[PDB]
Amino acid sequence: SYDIQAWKKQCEELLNLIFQCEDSEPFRQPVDLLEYPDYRDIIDTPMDFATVRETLEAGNYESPMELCKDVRLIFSNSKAYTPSKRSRIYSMSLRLSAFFEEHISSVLSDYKSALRFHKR
Numbered sequence: 865s866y867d868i869q870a871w872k873k874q875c876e877e878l879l880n881l882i883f884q885c886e887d888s889e890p891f892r893q894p895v896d897l898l899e900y901p902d903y904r905d906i907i908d909t910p911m912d913f914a915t916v917r918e919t920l921e922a923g924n925y926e927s928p929m930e931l932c933k934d935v936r937l938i939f940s941n942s943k944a945y946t947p948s949k950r951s952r953i954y955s956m957s958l959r960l961s962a963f964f965e966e967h968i969s970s971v972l973s974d975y976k977s978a979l980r981f982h983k984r
């Protein structure tokens with residue numbers, strides 16, 4: 865399965881599944897500082913799923929590794945901000961992360977295999 869471009873539609877589909885998850889609600893838009901006025905004190909690089917989707921559709925990811933780095937930043941920012949490991953939003957981030965990692969594994973493997981086949 866050596867299609868070097870297949871990752872992009874696979875990532876669009878996975879983002880659609882993440883938008884249908886109730887666990888994505890808090891991560892679907894850039895954090896509102898009005899509600900969280902200290903957020904940029906703690907979080908140097910905000911990230912959210914709408915920004916990831918727009919960056920993909922603009923053609924501003926070269927590889928699924930770059931998309932994966934931005935999605936992992938959504939989850940690390942939620943760990944950096946949580947006052948507790950028990951909190952609602954942090955618990956939603958951990959379930960959504962497990963879902964994402966389960967689904968991105970094959971996208972990354974197929975892409976890297978396709979690249980190796982191209983360079984053979």
Ligand SMILES: C[C@@H]1CN(C(=O)c2ccco2)CCN1C(=O)NCC(F)(F)F
Nearest residue numbers: 890891892893894895896942946953954
């Ligand atoms: C505060 C929330 C959740 N959150 C956290 O990581 C977190 C962990 C513990 C407390 O907050 C950051 C993202 N947040 C937003 O408002 N984002 C805008 C939205 F929701 F419209 F997409």
